[PDB]
């Protein structure tokens, strides 16, 4: 069949993806620029990720369309157009890992987060990560390439000049680089590290939510212990544990905890004097403080943790969708490399895996719109105005 037919389908789909990747990701950048509620460290990595996706539309897709022709090119110029997408994928990986780490610092050490993670430090990390992405993605230009063993028969058949090759990705980029270096070391290891970080985020949230409920149950159980106590010593023992728990949870809400600790201290002083009935009556006053302050604190803390779980799930879905979209091309590369007795994956499947990898540059704006109210409302305001 005339090659122009299948190539026309591939090219049209690539151009459609390029348009959507540019539109959605420009909208993400626009939202962060205009809305100060979206201007935080986490979202500077989101913008770095959107910038890599805009460049997939502006540059990697025009380069992929050019490469699909197998046009004659100077081998090192061919390597640049073949490898530029690896720089963007590597930058995306560093941005995804930075977002996971940022979310883990936020849940594990919230009191130290604002002092540790600043916009100035994030901007430096983004700059370093872009430099490292160029070094990793363009490692073939440094000499790990097939330019020293050109396919001269293919170059002659196409009328290529001296020092030129038919510019085809698998002719110039070594598969040992694609599998061991690019895939195993630079993609799979960071994705497994991201998986580890997300597991730790969810475990930390689960433990912190369980600790909020345990402290609330302990306060209520100890009030009953005091109510059913048969002497001042049993009231004292229960108030001693309550005072320690109140101080541990204190590490309008500050006023509430001041009242709580004070009321426990009043009851404890009475219990130390052998005044069981007066100590039990003083301990009953803790219910007023629990109802007016402590319950509100517990609800607000639980709500905050639930918002962090929801935000970490949104971030993990984007990392998982990056893995889903890119794994097929990497897995095909593993078959090409490790199974030389296997027929190469057919050209239609190679085009499909490339298109799927490109589609990853369209999806993040949709995940933000569906899962993040602040993005959704800002997108609505930009589109309306
Ligand atoms: C700021 C942005 C938009 C600049 C983009 C510049 C791009 C399009 C340029 C920079 C380097 C260029 C390549 C350098 C060398 C060669 C080898 C030649 O035999 C065929 C063209 C080819 C493969 C060029 C294609 C276009 C190219 C990739
Ligand atoms: C990431 C998730 C969705 C899993 C994706 C698995 C894909 C990439 C797998 C599943 C079955 C695989 C194919 C199974 C058999 C062959 C025949 C062999 O001669 C070339 C590779 C080829 C054609 C494989 C390419 C990769 C393949 C298509
Ligand atoms: C956690 C998961 C997603 C990590 C990725 C798993 C990858 C590395 C696995 C999944 C399936 C595997 C392939 C399954 C079958 C074959 C055919 C064999 O003749 C050579 C190895 C090869 C080609 C394997 C290479 C490694 C492979 C591609
Ligand atoms: N086998 C291939 N693998 C890859 C690739 C990128 C990341 C993981 O695998 N890209 C490929 C091919 C064959 C063609 N291309 C490609 C690369 C860049 N521009 C167009 C096509
Ligand atoms: C080859 C073309 C150029 C490739 C590199 C492009 C890099 C673009 C990066 C932009 C992301 C910026 C995100 C915001 C950083 C923090 C802002 C700040 O706090 O000052
Ligand atoms: C989540 C990642 C899952 C990855 C699954 C990868 C695909 C697994 C299937 C492997 C089947 C390989 C069959 C190769 C047959 C070649 C036969 C031959 O030509 O000699
Ligand atoms: C969307 C599905 C098709 C993506 C482009 C692959 C075309 C393959 C072909 O050449 O027939
Ligand atoms: C985007 C869709 C535009 C397609 C224009 C024609 C491309 C082609 O068939 O070569
Ligand atoms: C590429 C496009 C990225 C979109 C982000 C824009 C920054 C211009 C700013 C105008 C204004 O602030 O009024
Ligand atoms: C392709 C490159 C696209 C450029 C992206 C930069 C957009 C910057 C928008 C966020 C700015 C945040 C801030 O100023 O604090
Ligand atoms: C910025 C937009 C860039 C769009 C084009 C991408 C690169 C196209 C390179 C074409 C090279 C053809 C050279 C030849 O005729 O041998
Ligand atoms: C938004 C600006 C950047 C996008 C520009 C898009 C340009 C058009 C798309 C494809 C690149 C051109 C492909 C050239 C193939 C040359 C093939 C050959 O020489 O045989
Ligand atoms: C900020 C824009 C960065 C643009 C890409 C910079 C790196 C380009 C790589 C060039 C390596 C030199 C190859 C020379 C071959 C002869
Ligand atoms: C051949 C390897 C070359 C390595 C260096 C190439 C140039 C890399 C620089 C790219 C972008 C610089 C940082 C942009 C983001 C700044 C965010 C604030
Ligand atoms: C750590 C990251 C460092 C990034 C900067 C890398 C510097 C060395 C790049 C040298 C490229 C020379 C061109 C290669 C060639 O022409 O064959
Ligand atoms: C991760 C570990 C990968 C090891 C691959 C070894 C392959 C081989 O020896 O052929
Ligand atoms: C290959 C694994 C890719 C995982 C990416 C991150 C997903 C996080 C999931 C958490 C449960
Ligand atoms: C996650 C960890 C993944 C590790 C994957 C290892 C793949 C190793 C494949 C080795 C194939 C050997 C083929 C041969 O000996 O012919
Ligand atoms: C969505 C559906 C995508 C279907 C594409 C791939 C599934 C596996 C097809 C394998 C085709 C190659 C078989 C062969 O080597 O002859
Ligand atoms: Na990306």
UniProtKB/Swiss-Prot annotation:
Keywords on record: Cell membrane, Disulfide bond, G-protein coupled receptor, Glycoprotein, Membrane, Receptor, Transducer, Transmembrane, Transmembrane helix, Ubl conjugation
Side Cytoplasmic, residues: 34-43, 102-121, 200-314
Free-text description of this protein's post-translational modifications in UniProt: Ubiquitinated. Deubiquitinated by USP4; leading to stabilization and expression at the cell surface.
Membrane topology: Multi-pass membrane protein
Positions annotated as glycosylated: 155
Gene Ontology, cellular component aspect: asymmetric synapse; axolemma; dendrite; glutamatergic synapse; intermediate filament; membrane; neuronal cell body; plasma membrane
Segment of the intact protein contained: 2 to 305 of 412
A Gene Ontology biological process term: inhibitory postsynaptic potential
Protein's name according to its UniProt entry: Adenosine receptor A2a
Family classification: Belongs to the G-protein coupled receptor 1 family.
TM region positions: 9-33, 44-67, 79-101, 122-144, 175-199, 315-338, 347-370
């Amino acid at each position: 069949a005339p090659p122009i037919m299948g190539s026309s389908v591939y090219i049209t789909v690539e151009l459609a993806i390029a348009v959507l990747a540019i539109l959605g990701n420009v909208l993400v950048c626009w939202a962060v620029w205009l809305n100060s509620n979206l201007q935080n460290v986490t979202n500077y990595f989101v913008v770095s990720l959107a910038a890599a996706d805009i460049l997939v539309g502006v540059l990697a897709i025009p380069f992929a369309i050019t490469i699909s022709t197998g046009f004659c090119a100077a081998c090192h110029g061919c390597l640049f157009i073949a490898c530029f997408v690896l720089v963007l994928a590597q930058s995306s990986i560093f941005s995804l890992l930075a977002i996971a780490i940022d979310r883990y610092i936020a849940i594990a050490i919230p009191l130290r987060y604002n002092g540790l993670v600043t916009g100035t430090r994030a901007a430096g990390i983004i700059a370093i990560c872009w430099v490292l992405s160029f070094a990793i993605g363009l490692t073939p230009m440094l000499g790990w390439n097939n330019c020293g063993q050109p396919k001269e028969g293919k170059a002659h058949s196409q009328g290529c000049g001296e020092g030129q090759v038919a510019c085809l990705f698998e002719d110039v980029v070594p598969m040992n680089y694609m599998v061991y270096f690019n895939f195993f070391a630079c993609v799979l290891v960071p994705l497994l590290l991201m998986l580890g970080v997300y597991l730790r985020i969810f475990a930390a949230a689960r433990r912190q939510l369980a600790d909020l409920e345990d402290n609330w149950e302990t306060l209520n159980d100890n009030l009953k212990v005091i109510e059913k106590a048969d002497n001042a010593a049993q009231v004292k023992d229960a108030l001693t544990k309550m005072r320690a728990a109140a101080l541990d949870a204190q590490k309008d809400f500050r006023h509430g905890f001041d009242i709580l600790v004070g009321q426990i201290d009043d009851a404890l002083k009475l219990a130390n004097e052998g005044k069981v009935k007066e100590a039990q009556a003083a301990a009953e006053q803790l219910k007023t403080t629990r109802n007016a302050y402590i319950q509100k604190y517990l609800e607000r803390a639980r709500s905050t943790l639930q918002k962090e779980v929801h935000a970490a799930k949104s971030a993990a879905i984007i990392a998982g969708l990056f893995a889903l979209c890119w794994l097929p091309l990497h897995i095909i590369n593993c078959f090409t490399f490790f199974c030389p007795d296997c027929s190469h994956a057919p050209l239609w499947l190679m085009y499909l895996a490339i298109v799927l990898a490109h589609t990853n540059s369209v999806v993040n704006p949709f995940i933000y719109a569906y899962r993040i109210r602040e993005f959704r409302q800002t997108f609505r305001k930009i589109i309306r105005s």
